[PDB]
Amino acid sequence: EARRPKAKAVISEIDGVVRIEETEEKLSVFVESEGFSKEYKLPKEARLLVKDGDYVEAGQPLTRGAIDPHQLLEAKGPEAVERYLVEEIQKVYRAQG
């Protein structure tokens, strides 16, 4: 159905490189680009997938979880989401043999 999940992971809108900022009542991540960049707020115990300073593709999950296939489609293009969709279905079926 292409629903945007509840446990939605937050992907990156553009190319860039990250820098964590873990203060008490906020844990924000910046994916900075050679021009300008955006800031991604999220609850603190959220589980990262970016070692600070690493290099991210546009649409590459920063948090973990499921990916809104729409946020993906707009970010990385059809074969990109065509990819996610096929593999993600399969992981369920494999799991049951």
Swiss-Prot record:
Q: Which family does it belong to?
A: Belongs to the RNA polymerase beta' chain family.
Self-association and partners: The RNAP catalytic core consists of 2 alpha, 1 beta, 1 beta' and 1 omega subunit. When a sigma factor is associated with the core the holoenzyme is formed, which can initiate transcription.
The function of this protein is: DNA-dependent RNA polymerase catalyzes the transcription of DNA into RNA using the four ribonucleoside triphosphates as substrates.
* Protein name stated in the entry: DNA-directed RNA polymerase subunit beta'
- Lineage, broadest ranks: Bacteria, Thermotogati, Deinococcota, Deinococci, Thermales
Which span of the entire protein is present here? 1264 to 1360 of 1524
